[PDB]
Coordinates of C-alpha atoms and ligand atoms in Angstrom, one line a residue:
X1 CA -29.0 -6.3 -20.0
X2 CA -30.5 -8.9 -17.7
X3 CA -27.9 -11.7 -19.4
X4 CA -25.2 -8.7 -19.1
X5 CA -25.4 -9.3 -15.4
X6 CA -24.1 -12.9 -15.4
X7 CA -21.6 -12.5 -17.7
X8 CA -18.8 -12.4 -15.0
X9 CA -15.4 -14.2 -14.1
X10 CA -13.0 -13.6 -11.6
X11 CA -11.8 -14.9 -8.5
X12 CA -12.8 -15.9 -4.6
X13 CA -9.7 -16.4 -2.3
X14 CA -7.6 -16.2 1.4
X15 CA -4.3 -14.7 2.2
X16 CA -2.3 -14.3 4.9
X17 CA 0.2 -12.0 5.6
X18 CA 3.2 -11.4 8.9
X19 CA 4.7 -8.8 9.3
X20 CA 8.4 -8.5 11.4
X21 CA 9.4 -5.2 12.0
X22 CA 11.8 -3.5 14.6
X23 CA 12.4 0.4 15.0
X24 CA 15.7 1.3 16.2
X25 CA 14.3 5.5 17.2
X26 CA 16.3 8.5 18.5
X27 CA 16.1 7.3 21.6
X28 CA 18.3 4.7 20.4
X29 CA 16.4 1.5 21.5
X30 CA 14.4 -0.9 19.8
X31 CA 10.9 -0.8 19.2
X32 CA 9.1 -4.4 18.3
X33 CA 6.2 -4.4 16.2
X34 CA 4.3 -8.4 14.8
X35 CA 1.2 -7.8 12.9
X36 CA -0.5 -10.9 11.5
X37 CA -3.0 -10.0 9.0
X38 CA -5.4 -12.4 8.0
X39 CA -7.8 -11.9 4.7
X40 CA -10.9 -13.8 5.0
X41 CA -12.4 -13.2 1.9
X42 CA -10.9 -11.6 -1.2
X43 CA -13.3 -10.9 -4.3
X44 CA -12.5 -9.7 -7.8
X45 CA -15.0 -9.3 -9.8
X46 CA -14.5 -8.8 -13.6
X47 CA -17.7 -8.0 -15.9
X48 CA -15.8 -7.0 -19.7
X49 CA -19.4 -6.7 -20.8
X50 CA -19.5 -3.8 -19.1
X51 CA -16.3 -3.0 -19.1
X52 CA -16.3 -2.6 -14.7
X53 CA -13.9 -4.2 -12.3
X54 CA -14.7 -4.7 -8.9
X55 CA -12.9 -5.2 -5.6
X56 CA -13.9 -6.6 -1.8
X57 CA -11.7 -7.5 0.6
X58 CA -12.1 -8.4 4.6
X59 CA -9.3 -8.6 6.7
X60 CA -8.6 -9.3 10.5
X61 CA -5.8 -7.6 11.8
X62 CA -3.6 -7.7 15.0
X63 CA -0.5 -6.2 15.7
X64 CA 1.4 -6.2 19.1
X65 CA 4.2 -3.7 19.9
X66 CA 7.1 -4.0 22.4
X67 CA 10.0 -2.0 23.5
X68 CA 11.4 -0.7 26.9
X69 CA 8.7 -0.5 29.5
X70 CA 5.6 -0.4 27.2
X71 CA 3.8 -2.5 25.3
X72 CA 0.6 -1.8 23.2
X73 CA -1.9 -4.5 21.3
X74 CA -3.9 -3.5 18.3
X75 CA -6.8 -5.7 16.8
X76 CA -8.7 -4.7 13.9
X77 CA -11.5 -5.4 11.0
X78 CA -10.2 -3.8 7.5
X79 CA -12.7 -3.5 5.0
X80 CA -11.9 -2.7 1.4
X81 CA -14.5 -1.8 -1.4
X82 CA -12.7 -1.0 -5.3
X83 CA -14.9 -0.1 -8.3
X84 CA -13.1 0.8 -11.5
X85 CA -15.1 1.7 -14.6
X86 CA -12.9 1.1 -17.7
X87 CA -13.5 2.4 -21.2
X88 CA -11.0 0.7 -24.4
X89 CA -10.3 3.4 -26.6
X90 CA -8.6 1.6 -29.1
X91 CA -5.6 1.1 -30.6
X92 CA -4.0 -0.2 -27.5
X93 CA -5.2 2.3 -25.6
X94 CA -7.5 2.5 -22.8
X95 CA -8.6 4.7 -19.5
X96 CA -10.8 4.5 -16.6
X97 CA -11.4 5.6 -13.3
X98 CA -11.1 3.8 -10.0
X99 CA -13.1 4.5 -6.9
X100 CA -11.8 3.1 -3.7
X101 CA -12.9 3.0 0.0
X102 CA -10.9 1.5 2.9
X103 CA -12.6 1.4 6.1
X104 CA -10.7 0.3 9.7
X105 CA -12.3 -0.5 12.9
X106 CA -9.8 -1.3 15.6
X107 CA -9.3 -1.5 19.7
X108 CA -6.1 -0.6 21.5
X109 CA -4.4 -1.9 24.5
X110 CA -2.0 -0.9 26.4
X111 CA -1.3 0.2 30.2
X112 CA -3.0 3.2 30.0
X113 CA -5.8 2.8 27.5
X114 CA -8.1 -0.3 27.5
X115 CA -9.9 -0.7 24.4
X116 CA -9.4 2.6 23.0
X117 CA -11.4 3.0 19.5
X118 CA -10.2 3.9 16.6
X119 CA -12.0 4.5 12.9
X120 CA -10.5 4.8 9.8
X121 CA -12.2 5.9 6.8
X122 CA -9.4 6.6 3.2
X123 CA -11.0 7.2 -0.1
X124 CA -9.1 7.1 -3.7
X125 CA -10.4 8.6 -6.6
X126 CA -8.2 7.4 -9.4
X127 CA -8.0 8.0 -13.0
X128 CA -5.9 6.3 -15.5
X129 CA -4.8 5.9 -18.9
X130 CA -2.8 2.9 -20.4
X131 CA -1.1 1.5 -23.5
X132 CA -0.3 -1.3 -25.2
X133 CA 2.0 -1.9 -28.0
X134 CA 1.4 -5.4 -29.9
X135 CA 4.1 -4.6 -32.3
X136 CA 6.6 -3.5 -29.8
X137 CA 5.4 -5.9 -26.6
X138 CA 5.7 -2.5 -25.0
X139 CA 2.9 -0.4 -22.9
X140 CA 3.0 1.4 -19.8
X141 CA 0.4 2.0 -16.9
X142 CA -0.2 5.2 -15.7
X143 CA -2.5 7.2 -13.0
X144 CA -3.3 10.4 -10.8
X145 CA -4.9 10.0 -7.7
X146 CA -7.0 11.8 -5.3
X147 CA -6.5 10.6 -1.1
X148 CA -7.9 11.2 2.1
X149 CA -7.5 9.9 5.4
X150 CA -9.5 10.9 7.8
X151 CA -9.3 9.1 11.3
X152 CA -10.6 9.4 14.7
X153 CA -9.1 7.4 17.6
X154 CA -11.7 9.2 20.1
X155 CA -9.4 10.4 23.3
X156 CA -6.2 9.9 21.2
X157 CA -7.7 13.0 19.3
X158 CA -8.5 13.1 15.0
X159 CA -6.0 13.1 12.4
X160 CA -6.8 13.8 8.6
X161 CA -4.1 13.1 5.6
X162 CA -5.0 14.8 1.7
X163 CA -2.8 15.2 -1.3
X164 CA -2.3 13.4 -4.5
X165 CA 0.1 11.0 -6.1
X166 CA 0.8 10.3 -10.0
X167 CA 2.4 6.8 -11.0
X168 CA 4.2 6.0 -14.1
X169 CA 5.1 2.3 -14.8
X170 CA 6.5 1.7 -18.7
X171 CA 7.1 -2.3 -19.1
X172 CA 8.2 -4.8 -22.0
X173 CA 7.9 -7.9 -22.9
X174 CA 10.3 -10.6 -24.3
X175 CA 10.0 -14.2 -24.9
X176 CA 9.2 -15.6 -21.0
X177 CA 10.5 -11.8 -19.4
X178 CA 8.9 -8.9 -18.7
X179 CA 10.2 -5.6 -17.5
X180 CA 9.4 -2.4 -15.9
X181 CA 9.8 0.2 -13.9
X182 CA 7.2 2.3 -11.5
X183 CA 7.8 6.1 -11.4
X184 CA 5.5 7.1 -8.1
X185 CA 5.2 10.9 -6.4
X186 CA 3.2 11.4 -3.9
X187 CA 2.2 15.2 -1.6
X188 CA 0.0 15.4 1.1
X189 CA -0.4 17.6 4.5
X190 CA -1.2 16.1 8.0
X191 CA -3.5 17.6 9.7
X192 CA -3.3 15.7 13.6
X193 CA -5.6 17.4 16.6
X194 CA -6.3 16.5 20.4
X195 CA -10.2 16.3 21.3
X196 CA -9.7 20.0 22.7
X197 CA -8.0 21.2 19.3
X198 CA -4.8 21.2 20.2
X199 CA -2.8 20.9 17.1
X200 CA 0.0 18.0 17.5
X201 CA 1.0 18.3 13.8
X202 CA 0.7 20.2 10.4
X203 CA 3.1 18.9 8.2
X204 CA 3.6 18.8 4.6
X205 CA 4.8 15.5 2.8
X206 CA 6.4 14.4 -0.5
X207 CA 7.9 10.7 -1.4
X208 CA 9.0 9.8 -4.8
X209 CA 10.5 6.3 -5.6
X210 CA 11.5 4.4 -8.6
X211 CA 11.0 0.5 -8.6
X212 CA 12.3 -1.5 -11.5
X213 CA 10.5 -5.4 -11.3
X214 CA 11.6 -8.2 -13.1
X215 CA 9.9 -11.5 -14.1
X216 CA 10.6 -14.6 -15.7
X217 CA 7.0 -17.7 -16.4
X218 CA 8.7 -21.2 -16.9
X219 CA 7.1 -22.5 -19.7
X220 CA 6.3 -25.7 -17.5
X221 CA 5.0 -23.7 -14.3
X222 CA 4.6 -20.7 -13.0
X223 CA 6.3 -16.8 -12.4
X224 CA 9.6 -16.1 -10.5
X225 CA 9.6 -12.3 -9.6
X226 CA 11.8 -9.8 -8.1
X227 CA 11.1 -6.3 -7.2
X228 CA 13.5 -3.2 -5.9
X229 CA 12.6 0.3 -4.7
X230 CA 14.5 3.0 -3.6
X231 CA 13.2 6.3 -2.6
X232 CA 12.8 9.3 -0.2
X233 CA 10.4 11.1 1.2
X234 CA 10.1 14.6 3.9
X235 CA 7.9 15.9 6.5
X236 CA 8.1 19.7 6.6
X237 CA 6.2 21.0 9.8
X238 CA 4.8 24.3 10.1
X239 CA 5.4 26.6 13.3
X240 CA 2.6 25.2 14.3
X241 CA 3.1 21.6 15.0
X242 CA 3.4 20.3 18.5
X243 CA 5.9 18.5 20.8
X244 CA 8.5 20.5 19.7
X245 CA 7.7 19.3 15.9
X246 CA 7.2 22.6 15.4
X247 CA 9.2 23.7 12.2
X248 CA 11.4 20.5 12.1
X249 CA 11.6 18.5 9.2
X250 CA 12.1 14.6 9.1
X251 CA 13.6 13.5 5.8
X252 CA 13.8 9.4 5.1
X253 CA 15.7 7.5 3.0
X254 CA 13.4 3.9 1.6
X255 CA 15.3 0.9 0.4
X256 CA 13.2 -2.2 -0.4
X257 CA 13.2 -5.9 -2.3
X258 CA 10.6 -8.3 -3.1
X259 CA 10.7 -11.7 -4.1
X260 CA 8.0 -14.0 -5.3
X261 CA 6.3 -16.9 -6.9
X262 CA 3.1 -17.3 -8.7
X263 CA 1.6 -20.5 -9.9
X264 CA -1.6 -21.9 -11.5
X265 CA -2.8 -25.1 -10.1
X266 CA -4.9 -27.0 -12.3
X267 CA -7.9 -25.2 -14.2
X268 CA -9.1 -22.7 -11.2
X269 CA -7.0 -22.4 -8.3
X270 CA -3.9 -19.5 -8.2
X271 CA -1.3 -20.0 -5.4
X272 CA 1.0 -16.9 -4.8
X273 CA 4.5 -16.7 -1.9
X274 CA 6.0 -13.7 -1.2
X275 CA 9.2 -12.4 0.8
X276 CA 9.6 -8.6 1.2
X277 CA 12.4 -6.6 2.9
X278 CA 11.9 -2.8 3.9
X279 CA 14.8 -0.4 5.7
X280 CA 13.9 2.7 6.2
X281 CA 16.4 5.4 7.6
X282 CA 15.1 8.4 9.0
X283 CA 16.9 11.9 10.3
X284 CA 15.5 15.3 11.6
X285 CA 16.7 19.1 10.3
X286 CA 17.2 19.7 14.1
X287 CA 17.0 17.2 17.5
X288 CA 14.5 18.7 20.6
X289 CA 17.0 17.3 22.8
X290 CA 15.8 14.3 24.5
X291 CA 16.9 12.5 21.9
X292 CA 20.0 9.8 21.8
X293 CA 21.1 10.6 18.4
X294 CA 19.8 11.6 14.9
X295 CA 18.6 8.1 13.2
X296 CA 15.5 6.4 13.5
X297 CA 15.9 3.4 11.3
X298 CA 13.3 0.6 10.6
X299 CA 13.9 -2.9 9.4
X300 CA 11.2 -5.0 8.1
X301 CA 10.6 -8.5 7.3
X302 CA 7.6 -9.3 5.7
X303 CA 5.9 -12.8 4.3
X304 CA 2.8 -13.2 2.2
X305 CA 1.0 -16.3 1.0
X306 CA -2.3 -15.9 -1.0
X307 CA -4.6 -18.7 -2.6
X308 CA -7.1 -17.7 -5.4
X309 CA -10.1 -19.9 -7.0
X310 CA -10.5 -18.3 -10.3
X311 CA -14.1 -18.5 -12.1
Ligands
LIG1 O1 -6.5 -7.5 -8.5 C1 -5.9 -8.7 -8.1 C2 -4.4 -8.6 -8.2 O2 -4.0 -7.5 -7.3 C3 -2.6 -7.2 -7.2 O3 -2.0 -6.8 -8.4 C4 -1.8 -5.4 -8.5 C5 -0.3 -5.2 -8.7 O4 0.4 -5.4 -7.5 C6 0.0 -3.7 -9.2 O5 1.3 -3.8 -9.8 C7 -1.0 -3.3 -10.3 O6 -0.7 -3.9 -11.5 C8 -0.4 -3.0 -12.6 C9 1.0 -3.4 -13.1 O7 2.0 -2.7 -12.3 C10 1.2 -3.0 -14.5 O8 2.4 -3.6 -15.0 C11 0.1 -3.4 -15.5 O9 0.0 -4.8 -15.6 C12 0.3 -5.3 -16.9 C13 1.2 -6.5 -16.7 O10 2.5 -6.0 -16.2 C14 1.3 -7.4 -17.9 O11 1.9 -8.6 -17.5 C15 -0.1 -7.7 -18.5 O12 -0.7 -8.7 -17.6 C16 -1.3 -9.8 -18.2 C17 -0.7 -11.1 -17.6 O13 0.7 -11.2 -17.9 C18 -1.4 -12.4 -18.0 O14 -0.9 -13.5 -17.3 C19 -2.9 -12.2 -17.7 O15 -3.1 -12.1 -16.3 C20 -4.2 -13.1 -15.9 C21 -3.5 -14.1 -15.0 O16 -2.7 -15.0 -15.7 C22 -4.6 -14.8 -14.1 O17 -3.9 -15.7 -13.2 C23 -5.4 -13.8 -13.4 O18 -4.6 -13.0 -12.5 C24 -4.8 -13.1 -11.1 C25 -3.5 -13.2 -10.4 O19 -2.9 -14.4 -10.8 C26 -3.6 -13.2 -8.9 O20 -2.4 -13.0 -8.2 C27 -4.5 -11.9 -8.5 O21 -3.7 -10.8 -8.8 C28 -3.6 -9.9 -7.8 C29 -2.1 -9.6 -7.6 O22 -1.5 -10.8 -7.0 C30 -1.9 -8.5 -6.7 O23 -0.5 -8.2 -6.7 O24 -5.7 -11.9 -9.2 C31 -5.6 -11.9 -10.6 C32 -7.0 -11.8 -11.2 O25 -7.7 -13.0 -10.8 O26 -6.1 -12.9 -14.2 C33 -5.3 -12.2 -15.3 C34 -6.4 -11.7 -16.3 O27 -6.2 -12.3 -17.5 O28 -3.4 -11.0 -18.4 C35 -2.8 -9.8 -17.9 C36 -3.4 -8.6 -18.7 O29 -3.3 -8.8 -20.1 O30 -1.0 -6.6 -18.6 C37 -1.0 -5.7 -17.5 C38 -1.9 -4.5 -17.9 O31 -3.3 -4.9 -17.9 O32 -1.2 -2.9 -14.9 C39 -1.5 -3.2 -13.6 C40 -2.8 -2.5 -13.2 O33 -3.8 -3.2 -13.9 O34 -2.4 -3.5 -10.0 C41 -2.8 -4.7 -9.4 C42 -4.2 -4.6 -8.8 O35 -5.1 -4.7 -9.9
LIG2 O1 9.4 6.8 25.4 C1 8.4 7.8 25.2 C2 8.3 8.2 23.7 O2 9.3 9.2 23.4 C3 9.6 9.5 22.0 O3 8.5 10.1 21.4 C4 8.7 11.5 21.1 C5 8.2 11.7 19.6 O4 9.1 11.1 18.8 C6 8.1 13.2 19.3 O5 7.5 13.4 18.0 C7 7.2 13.9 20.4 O6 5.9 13.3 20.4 C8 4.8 14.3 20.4 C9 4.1 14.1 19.0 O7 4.8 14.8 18.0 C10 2.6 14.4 19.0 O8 2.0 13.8 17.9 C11 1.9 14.0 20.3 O9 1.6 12.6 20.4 C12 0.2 12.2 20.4 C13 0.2 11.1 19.3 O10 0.3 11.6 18.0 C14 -1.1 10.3 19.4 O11 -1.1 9.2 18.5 C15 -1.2 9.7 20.8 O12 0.0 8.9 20.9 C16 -0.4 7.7 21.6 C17 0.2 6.6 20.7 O13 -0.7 6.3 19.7 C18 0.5 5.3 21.5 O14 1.3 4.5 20.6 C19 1.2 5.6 22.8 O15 2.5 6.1 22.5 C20 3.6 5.3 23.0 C21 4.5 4.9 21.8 O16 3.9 3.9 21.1 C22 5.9 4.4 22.3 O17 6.7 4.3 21.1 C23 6.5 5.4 23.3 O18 6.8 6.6 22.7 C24 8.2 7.0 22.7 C25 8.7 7.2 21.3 O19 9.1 6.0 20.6 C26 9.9 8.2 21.2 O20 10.1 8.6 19.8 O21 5.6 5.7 24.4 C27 4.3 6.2 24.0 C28 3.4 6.4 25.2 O22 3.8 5.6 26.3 O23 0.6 6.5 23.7 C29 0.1 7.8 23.1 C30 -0.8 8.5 24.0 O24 -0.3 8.5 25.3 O25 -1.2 10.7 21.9 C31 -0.2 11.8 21.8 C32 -0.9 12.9 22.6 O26 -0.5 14.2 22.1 O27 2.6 14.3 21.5 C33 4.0 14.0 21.6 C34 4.5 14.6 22.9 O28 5.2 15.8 22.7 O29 7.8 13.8 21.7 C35 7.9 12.4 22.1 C36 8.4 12.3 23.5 O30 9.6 13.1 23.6
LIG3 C1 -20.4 -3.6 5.2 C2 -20.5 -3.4 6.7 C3 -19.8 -4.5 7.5 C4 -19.8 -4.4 9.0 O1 -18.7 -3.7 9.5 C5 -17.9 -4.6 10.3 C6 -16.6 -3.9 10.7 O2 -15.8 -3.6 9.6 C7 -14.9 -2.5 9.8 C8 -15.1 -1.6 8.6 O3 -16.2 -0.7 8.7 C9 -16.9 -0.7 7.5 C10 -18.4 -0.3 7.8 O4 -19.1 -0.2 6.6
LIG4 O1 10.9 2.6 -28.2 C1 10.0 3.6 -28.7 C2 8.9 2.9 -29.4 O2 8.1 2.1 -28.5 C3 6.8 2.4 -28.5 C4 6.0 1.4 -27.6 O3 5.5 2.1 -26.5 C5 6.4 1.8 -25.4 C6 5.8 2.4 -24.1 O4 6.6 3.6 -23.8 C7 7.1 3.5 -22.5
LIG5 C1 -8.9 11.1 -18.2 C2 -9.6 10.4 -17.0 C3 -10.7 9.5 -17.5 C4 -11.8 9.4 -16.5 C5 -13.1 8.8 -17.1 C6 2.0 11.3 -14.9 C7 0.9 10.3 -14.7 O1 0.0 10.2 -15.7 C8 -1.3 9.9 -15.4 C9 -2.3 10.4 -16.4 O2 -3.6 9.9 -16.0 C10 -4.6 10.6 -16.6 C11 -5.9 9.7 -16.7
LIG6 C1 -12.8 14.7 -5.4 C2 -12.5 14.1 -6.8 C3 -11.1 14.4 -7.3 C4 -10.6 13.5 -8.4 O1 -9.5 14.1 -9.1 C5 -8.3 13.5 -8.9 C6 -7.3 14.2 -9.9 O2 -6.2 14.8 -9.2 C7 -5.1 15.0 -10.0 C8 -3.9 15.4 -9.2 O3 -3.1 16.4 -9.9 C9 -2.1 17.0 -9.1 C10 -2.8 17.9 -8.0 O4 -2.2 19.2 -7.9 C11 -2.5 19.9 -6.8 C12 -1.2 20.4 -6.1
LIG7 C1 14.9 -6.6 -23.8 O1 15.0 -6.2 -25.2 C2 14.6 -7.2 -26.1 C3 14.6 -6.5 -27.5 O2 13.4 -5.9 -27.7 C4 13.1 -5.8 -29.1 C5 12.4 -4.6 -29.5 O3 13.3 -3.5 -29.7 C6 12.6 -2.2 -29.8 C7 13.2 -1.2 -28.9 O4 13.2 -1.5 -27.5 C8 14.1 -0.8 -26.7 C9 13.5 -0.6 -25.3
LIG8 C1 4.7 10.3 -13.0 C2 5.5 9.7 -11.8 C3 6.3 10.9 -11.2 C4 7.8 10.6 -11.4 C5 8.6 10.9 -10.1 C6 9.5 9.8 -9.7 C7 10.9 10.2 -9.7 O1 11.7 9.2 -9.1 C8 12.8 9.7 -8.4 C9 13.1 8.7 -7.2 O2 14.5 8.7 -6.9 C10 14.6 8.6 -5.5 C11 16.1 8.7 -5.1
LIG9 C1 15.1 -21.8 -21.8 C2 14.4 -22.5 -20.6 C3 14.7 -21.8 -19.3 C4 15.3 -22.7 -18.3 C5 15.4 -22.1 -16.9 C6 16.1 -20.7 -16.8 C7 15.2 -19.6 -16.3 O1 15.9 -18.7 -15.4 C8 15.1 -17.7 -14.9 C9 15.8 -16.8 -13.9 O2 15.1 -15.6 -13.9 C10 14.9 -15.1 -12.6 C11 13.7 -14.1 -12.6 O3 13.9 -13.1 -11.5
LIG10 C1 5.6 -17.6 2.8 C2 6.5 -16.5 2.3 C3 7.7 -17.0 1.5 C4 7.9 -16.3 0.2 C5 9.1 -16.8 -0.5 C6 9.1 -16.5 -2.0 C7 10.3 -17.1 -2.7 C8 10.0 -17.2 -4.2 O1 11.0 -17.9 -4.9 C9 10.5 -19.1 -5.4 C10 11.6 -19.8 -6.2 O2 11.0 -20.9 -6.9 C11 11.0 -20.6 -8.3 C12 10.5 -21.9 -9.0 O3 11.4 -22.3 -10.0 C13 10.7 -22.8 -11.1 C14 10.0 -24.0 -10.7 O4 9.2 -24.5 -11.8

C-alpha cells in the first residue's frame, strides 16, 4: 500500500505547438488567426499497480487575429487535469473510466475591449471498453463520453455546450504496420446569452467523421505516421437564436491530414514532429443578407514538436 505508491513510471516533457489559420467568411475576406501554444509542463503518470493513469498539463497560450479593420489578441493559461481508473478483465479485454477537467483563463484585446476576461471550465466523463487479440494482432478502442462547456467571458455574456460523443477505432497489426480507423459522433446544444439574457444562440449540433491512420516503426529508429479525416457536421438553430441565426442552419464539410514522426532517443527521452492540414468548408440553409456569398471556408496549417523524458 505504502510501497504501492512508488510504484510509478511515466513521463515529464515540453511541446510546442503553431497554429496558421486563415478564414475566408461570407463576407468574402480573409480573416488571420496565429496561435502559438506553448506546454510548459506535461505529466503522465502511470501506476499499473493500481491499475490508474493520470494526466497534467500547463499551457501558455496566445493567439492574435487580423482581418479588415480589426484586430483582436488573446493570451491565455490552459490547465488540464485527466484521471482514468482502468480495470483488465481478461482475455484481452479491458474497461475504465476517464475523468477530465480543462480549465482556461484568458484576456482579450482589441479596440474596443481592453483586457476582457474570459473563464473556461469543460469536464469529460468517459467510459471505455477495449480489446485485444494476440492471435489476430487485432483490437479496437472504444468510448462514450459525457461534455460540458461552460464559459463566461463577463461583458461578452456566458455560453454553455452539452452533449455526448461515442468513438470507435478497430486497428491491426502486421510485421512493422499498424492500421486503423476512428469512427467518432458527436451531439451537443449551444446554449450562448448576453449578461441581460439575451439569447444569441440555441443551436443543436452533430459531427461524425471517419479517420483511417497508418503507421510504419523502422526497425533501426523510430515511427513514420499519417493520418486522414473526412467528415461533416451541422448547426440547427431554433427560432430563438439571435442575429438573424434564428432558424438557420450552418452545415460544414471537414477535410484533414496529419503527418508525423516519433522517435526514442537513447534509454529515456521521446522526441515527436508533427505537420497537420485542416480545410473546413462551411454553407448556411439561408443567407441574412449582408453577406457576400454562401461559403465560409477555413484553411489551417498546423506544426507540433513535443519532447518527453520517460521514467
Ligand atoms: O498520453 C500521452 C500520449 O497522448 C497522445 O496519444 C493519444 C492518441 O493521440 C489517441 O489516439 C489515443 O490513443 C488511442 C489510440 O487511437 C488507439 O489505437 C489505442 O492505442 C493502441 C495502439 O494503437 C497500439 O499501437 C498499442 O500501443 C502500444 C505501442 O505500439 C507500444 O509502442 C507501446 O507504447 C509505449 C511507447 O513505445 C512509449 O514510447 C510510451 O509512449 C509515449 C509516447 O511515445 C509519447 O508520444 C506520449 O504519447 C502521447 C501521444 O503522443 C499523444 O498523441 O506519451 C506516451 C507515454 O509516455 O509509452 C507506451 C507504453 O508502453 O505500448 C502501447 C500499448 O501496448 O496499444 C494501444 C492500446 O493500448 O488506444 C489509445 C487510447 O489508449 O489516446 C492517447 C492519449 O492517451
Ligand atoms: O465585420 C463584422 C462581422 O460581421 C460578420 O459577423 C456576423 C455573424 O457571422 C453572424 O452570426 C451575426 O453575428 C451575431 C451572432 O450570431 C451572435 O452570437 C452575437 O455575437 C456576440 C458574440 O457571440 C460574442 O462572442 C461577442 O462577440 C465578440 C467577439 O468575441 C469578438 O471576436 C469581436 O467580434 C469581431 C469578430 O472577431 C470579427 O470577425 C468581426 O466580425 C465580423 C464577422 O467575421 C462576420 O461574419 O468583427 C467583430 C466585432 O468587431 O467582438 C464581439 C463583441 O463586439 O459579442 C457578440 C454580442 O452579441 O451577435 C451578432 C450580431 O448579430 O451577425 C454578424 C454581423 O452581421
Ligand atoms: C491549480 C491552480 C493553478 C492556478 O491557476 C492559474 C491559472 O490557470 C488557469 C486555469 O485555472 C485553473 C484553476 O484551478
Ligand atoms: O476478423 C474477424 C476476427 O478478428 C477478431 C479480432 O478482433 C478484431 C477487432 O475487431 C475490429
Ligand atoms: C462500462 C463502463 C465501465 C465504467 C467502470 C459505440 C462506442 O462504444 C463505446 C462503449 O463504451 C462502453 C464503456
Ligand atoms: C454526469 C455523468 C455522466 C456519465 O455518463 C456518460 C455516458 O453517456 C453515454 C452517452 O450515450 C448517448 C447519450 O444519449 C442521449 C441522447
Ligand atoms: C494487413 O493484413 C495482413 C494479414 O493479416 C493476417 C490475419 O488475417 C486475419 C483476417 O484479417 C482481416 C482484416
Ligand atoms: C461508434 C462511432 C459512431 C460511428 C459514426 C461515424 C460514421 O462516420 C461517417 C462519417 O462520414 C462522413 C462523410
Ligand atoms: C524491410 C525494411 C524496410 C525498409 C524501408 C521501407 C519502409 O517504408 C515505409 C513507408 O511507410 C510509410 C508510412 O506512412
Ligand atoms: C515541426 C513540425 C514539422 C513536422 C513534420 C513531420 C514530418 C514527418 O516525416 C518525417 C519523415 O522522416 C521519416 C524517417 O525515416 C526513417 C528514418 O529512420
Amino acid at each position: 500500500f505504502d510501497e504501492s505508491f512508488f510504484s510509478f513510471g511515466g513521463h515529464v516533457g515540453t511541446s510546442v505547438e503553431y497554429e496558421d489559420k486563415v478564414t475566408r467568411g461570407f463576407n468574402n475576406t480573409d480573416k488571420k488567426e496565429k496561435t502559438i501554444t506553448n506546454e510548459v509542463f506535461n505529466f503522465f503518470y502511470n501506476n499499473p499497480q493500481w491499475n490508474f493513469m493520470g494526466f497534467y498539463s500547463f499551457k501558455i497560450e496566445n493567439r492574435e487575429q487580423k482581418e479588415p479593420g480589426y484586430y483582436e489578441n488573446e493570451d491565455g493559461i490552459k490547465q488540464l487535469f485527466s484521471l482514468n481508473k482502468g480495470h483488465d478483465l481478461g482475455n484481452g479485454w479491458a474497461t475504465g473510466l476517464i475523468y477530465e477537467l480543462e480549465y482556461t483563463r484568458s484576456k482579450v484585446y482589441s479596440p474596443d475591449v481592453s483586457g476582457l476576461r474570459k473563464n473556461l471550465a469543460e469536464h469529460s466523463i468517459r467510459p471505455y471498453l477495449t480489446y485485444w487479440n494476440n492471435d489476430y494482432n487485432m483490437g479496437f478502442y472504444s468510448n462514450l463520453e459525457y461534455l460540458l462547456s461552460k464559459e463566461d467571458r463577463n461583458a461578452w455574456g456566458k455560453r454553455q455546450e452539452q452533449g455526448y460523443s461515442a468513438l470507435f477505432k478497430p486497428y491491426k497489426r502486421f510485421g512493422n504496420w499498424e492500421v486503423g480507423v476512428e469512427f467518432y459522433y458527436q451531439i451537443k446544444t449551444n446554449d450562448e446569452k448576453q449578461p441581460d439574457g439575451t439569447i444569441n444562440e440555441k443551436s443543436d449540433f452533430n459531427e461524425r467523421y471517419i479517420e483511417p491512420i497508418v503507421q510504419y516503426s523502422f526497425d533501426d529508429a523510430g515511427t513514420l505516421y499519417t493520418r486522414v479525416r473526412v467528415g461533416k457536421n451541422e448547426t440547427k438553430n431554433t427560432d430563438r437564436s439571435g442575429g438573424g441565426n434564428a432558424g438557420i442552419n450552418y452545415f460544414k464539410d471537414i477535410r484533414k491530414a496529419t503527418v508525423g514522426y516519433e522517435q526514442s532517443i537513447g534509454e529515456s527521452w521521446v522526441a515527436k514532429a508533427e505537420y497537420e492540414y485542416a480545410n473546413e468548408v462551411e454553407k448556411k440553409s439561408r443567407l441574412s443578407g449582408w453577406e457576400a456569398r454562401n461559403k465560409s471556408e477555413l484553411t489551417q496549417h498546423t506544426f507540433y514538436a513535443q519532447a518527453l523524458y520517460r521514467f
